[PDB]
Amino acid sequence: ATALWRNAQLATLNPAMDGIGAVENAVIAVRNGRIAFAGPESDLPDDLSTADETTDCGGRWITPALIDCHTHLVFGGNRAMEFEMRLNGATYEEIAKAGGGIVSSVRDTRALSDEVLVAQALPRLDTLLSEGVSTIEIKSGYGLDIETELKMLRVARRLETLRPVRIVTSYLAAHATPADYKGRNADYITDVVLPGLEKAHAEGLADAVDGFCEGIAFSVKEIDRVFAAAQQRGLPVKLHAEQLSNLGGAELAASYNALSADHLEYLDETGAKALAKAGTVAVLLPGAFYALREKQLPPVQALRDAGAEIALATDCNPGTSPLTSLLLTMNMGATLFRMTVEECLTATTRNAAKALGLLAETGTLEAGKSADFAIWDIERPAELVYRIGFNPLHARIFKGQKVS
Amino acid sequence: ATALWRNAQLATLNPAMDGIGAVENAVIAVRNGRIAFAGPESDLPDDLSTADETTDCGGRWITPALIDCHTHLVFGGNRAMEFEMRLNGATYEEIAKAGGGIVSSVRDTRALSDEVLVAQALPRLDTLLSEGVSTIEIKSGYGLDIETELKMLRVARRLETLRPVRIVTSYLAAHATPADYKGRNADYITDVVLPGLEKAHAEGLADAVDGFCEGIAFSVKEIDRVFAAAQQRGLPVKLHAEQLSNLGGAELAASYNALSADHLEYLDETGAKALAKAGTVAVLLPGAFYALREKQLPPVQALRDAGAEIALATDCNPGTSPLTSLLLTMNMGATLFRMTVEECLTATTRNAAKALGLLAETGTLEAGKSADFAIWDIERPAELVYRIGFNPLHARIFKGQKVS
Ligand SMILES: [Cl-]
Ligand SMILES: [Fe+3]
Ligand SMILES: [Fe+3]
Ligand SMILES: [Mg+2]
Ligand SMILES: [Mg+2]
* DSSP 8-state code for residue A268: -
Q: Which of residues 305-344 of B touch A (CB under 8 A)?
A: 321-325, 328, 334-335, 338-341
Q: Are residues A241 and A381 in the same domain?
A: no
Among B197, B280, B191, smallest CA distance to B232 is for B197
Q: Are residues A352 and A383 in the same domain?
A: no
- Whether the CB of A179 is below 8 Å from some CB of chain B: the reply is no
Provide the CB-side half-sphere exposure for A398 (13 A, CA). Answer: 19
Q: Is A34 helix (H, G, I), strand (E, B) or coil?
A: strand
Its domain, for residue B10, covers 1-64+364-404
Question: Which residues of B participate in the annotated binding site for N-formimidoyl-L-glutamate?
Answer: 142, 317, 319
CA of A87 to the centre of ligand 1 (A): 45
As a whole number of angstroms, the distance between CA B241 and CA B214 comes to 7
As a whole number of angstroms, the distance between CA A201 and CA A178 comes to 22
Residue type at A374 in one-letter notation: A
Residue A364 among known ligand-binding residues: no
* DSSP code string of B43-54: S--GGGS--SEE
Task: At B90, give phi and psi (nearest 5°).
Answer: -70, 140
Q: Are residues B175 and B278 in the same domain?
A: yes
Q: Are residues B110 and B201 in the same domain?
A: yes
Nearest 5 degrees, angle CA A361-CA A367-CA A368? 45
Residue B111: how many other CB atoms lie within 10 Å:
12
Helix, strand, coil in percent for chain A, rounding step 5:
40, 20, 40
Residue A290 among known ligand-binding residues: no
Cβ contact B388–A323 (<8 Å): yes
* DSSP 8-state code for residue A190: I
In sequence order, which residues have a C-beta less than 8 Å from that of residue A161 and are 6 or more positions away?
A: none
Q: Determine contact, residues B253/B232, Cβ cutoff 8 Å.
A: no
Q: Determine contact, residues A169/A159, Cβ cutoff 8 Å.
A: no
Cβ contact B325–A79 (<8 Å): no
Residue A320 among known ligand-binding residues: yes
Q: Determine contact, residues B188/B177, Cβ cutoff 8 Å.
A: yes
As a whole number of angstroms, the distance between CA B58 and CA A35 comes to 47
In sequence order, which residues have a C-beta less than 8 Å from that of residue A12 and are 6 or more positions away?
A: A20, A21, A22, A23, A38, A39, A64, A364, A365, A366
As a whole number of angstroms, the distance between CA A272 and CA A305 comes to 9
Q: Which residues of B touch A84 (CB under 8 A)?
A: 340-341, 382, 385-386
- Whether the CB of B80 is below 8 Å from some CB of chain A: the reply is yes
CA of A1 to the centre of ligand 4 (A): 29
Which element (helix H / strand E) includes A213? strand A212-213
Beta partners for residue B170, in sequence order:
B139, B208
Total residues belonging to chain A: 404
Domain harbouring B226, CATH code: 3.20.20.140
Residue A88 among known ligand-binding residues: no
Residue type at A241 in one-letter notation: A
* DSSP code string of A269-301: HHHHHHHHHHT-EEEE-HHHHHHTT------HH
As a whole number of angstroms, the distance between CA A86 and CA B334 comes to 10
Q: Is B383 helix (H, G, I), strand (E, B) or coil?
A: helix
Which element (helix H / strand E) includes A125? helix A114-129
As a whole number of angstroms, the distance between CA B242 and CA B261 comes to 9
As a whole number of angstroms, the distance between CA B224 and CA B221 comes to 5
Q: Is A246 helix (H, G, I), strand (E, B) or coil?
A: coil
CA of B255 to the centre of ligand 3 (A): 21
In a mutagenesis test of the A interface, which of B66, B68, B84 is the best target, namely the one with the most A β-carbons within 10 Å?
B84
Nearest chain B CA: its distance from A83 CA (Å):
7
As a whole number of angstroms, the distance between CA A384 and CA A9 comes to 15
Q: Determine contact, residues B125/B159, Cβ cutoff 8 Å.
A: yes
CA of A141 to the centre of ligand 2 (A): 9
Domain harbouring B48, CATH code: 2.30.40.10
Provide the CB-side half-sphere exposure for B284 (13 A, CA). Answer: 34
- Whether the CB of A387 is below 8 Å from some CB of chain B: the reply is yes
Q: Are residues B397 and B300 in the same domain?
A: no
In sequence order, which residues have a C-beta less than 8 Å from that of residue A5 and are 6 or more positions away?
A: A27, A28, A30, A54, A55, A57, A62, A375, A397
Residue A257 among known ligand-binding residues: no
- What residues sit around ligand 2, an ion, with C-beta below 5 angstroms? A 315
- Whether the CB of B126 is below 8 Å from some CB of chain A: the reply is no
Q: Determine contact, residues A345/A384, Cβ cutoff 8 Å.
A: yes
Q: Which residues of A touch B389 (CB under 8 A)?
A: 127, 314, 323-325, 328, 389
Point out the residue among A338, A380, A390 whose CB comes nearest to the CB of B324.
A390
CA of B84 to the centre of ligand 1 (A): 22
Task: At B393, give phi and psi (nearest 5°).
Answer: -65, 130
- Whether the CB of B77 is below 8 Å from some CB of chain A: the reply is no
User: Can you give the resolution of this entry in Å?
Assistant: 1.9
Among B322, B387, B328, B339, smallest CA distance to B130 is for B328
Q: Are residues B199 and B114 in the same domain?
A: yes
In sequence order, which residues have a C-beta less than 8 Å from that of residue B139 and are 6 or more positions away?
A: B70, B71, B72, B74, B152, B169, B170, B171, B172, B175, B210
Beta partners for residue B158, in sequence order:
none
Nearest 5 degrees, angle CA A118-CA A121-CA A124? 155
As a whole number of angstroms, the distance between CA B12 and CA B24 comes to 11
- Whether the CB of A70 is below 8 Å from some CB of chain B: the reply is no
Point out the residue among A87, A325, A335 whose CB comes nearest to the CB of B389.
A325
* DSSP code string of B190-209: IIIIHHHHHHHHHTT--SEE
Beta partners for residue A284, in sequence order:
A312
CB contacts < 8 Å between A and B, how many?
120
Residues B122-136, buried b or exposed e (16+ Cβ, 10 A)? eebbebbbbbbbbbb
Residue type at A28 in one-letter notation: I
Point out the residue among A84, A338, A389 whose CB comes nearest to the CB of B324.
A389
CA of B107 to the centre of ligand 1 (A): 19
Q: Which residues of A touch B328 (CB under 8 A)?
A: 328, 388-389
As a whole number of angstroms, the distance between CA B220 and CA B401 comes to 44
Nearest chain B CA: its distance from A133 CA (Å):
14
Cβ contact B382–A341 (<8 Å): no
Q: Are residues B372 and B341 in the same domain?
A: no
Q: Are residues A145 and A199 in the same domain?
A: yes
Q: Which residues of B touch A387 (CB under 8 A)?
A: 78, 80, 322, 324
Cβ contact B83–A322 (<8 Å): no
As a whole number of angstroms, the distance between CA A144 and CA A123 comes to 24
As a whole number of angstroms, the distance between CA A90 and CA B166 comes to 39
Q: Which residues of A touch B385 (CB under 8 A)?
A: 80, 83-84
CA of B240 to the centre of ligand 3 (A): 7
Among B160, B150, B85, B91, smallest CA distance to B121 is for B160
Residue A145: C-alpha distances to residues A102, A200, A298, A337 (Å)? 14, 12, 32, 36
As a whole number of angstroms, the distance between CA A263 and CA A267 comes to 9
Residue A14: how many other CB atoms lie within 10 Å:
20
As a whole number of angstroms, the distance between CA B147 and CA B192 comes to 9
Which element (helix H / strand E) includes A375? strand A373-376
Among B263, B216, B225, B236, smallest CA distance to B72 is for B263
Cβ contact B83–A339 (<8 Å): no
Domain count, chain A: 2
How are beta strands B53-56 and B2-11 bridged, if at all? parallel
Q: Are residues A307 and A322 in the same domain?
A: yes
Point out the residue among B323, B383, B388 whose CB comes nearest to the CB of A291.
B388
Which element (helix H / strand E) includes B35? strand B34-40
Q: Which ligand is nearest to the CA of B236?
A: 5
Q: Are residues B167 and B314 in the same domain?
A: yes
Q: Which residues of B touch A61 (CB under 8 A)?
A: none
Q: How was this structure determined?
A: X-ray
- What residues sit around ligand 4, an ion, with C-beta below 5 angstroms? A 377
Q: Are residues A218 and A129 in the same domain?
A: yes
Q: What is the CA radius of gyration of chain A?
A: 21
- Whether the CB of A79 is below 8 Å from some CB of chain B: the reply is yes
Question: Most distant CA pair in chain B: distance in Å?
Answer: 70
How are beta strands A166-171 and A310-312 bridged, if at all? unpaired
Beta partners for residue A137, in sequence order:
A168
Nearest chain B CA: its distance from A257 CA (Å):
31
Q: Determine contact, residues A194/A161, Cβ cutoff 8 Å.
A: no
Which element (helix H / strand E) includes B353? helix B350-355
Q: Are residues A130 and A198 in the same domain?
A: yes
Cβ contact B383–A341 (<8 Å): no
Q: Is A239 helix (H, G, I), strand (E, B) or coil?
A: strand
Nearest 5 degrees, angle CA A286-CA A292-CA A295? 75
Residue type at B108 in one-letter notation: D
Q: Which residues of A touch B324 (CB under 8 A)?
A: 387-390
* DSSP code string of A42-75: GG--GGGS--SEEEE-TT-EEEEPEEE-------
Q: In sequence order, which ranges of B238-315 are alpha helices (DSSP H)?
A: 249-255, 269-278, 286-291, 300-306
Residue B104: how many other CB atoms lie within 10 Å:
23
As a whole number of angstroms, the distance between CA A37 and CA A315 comes to 33
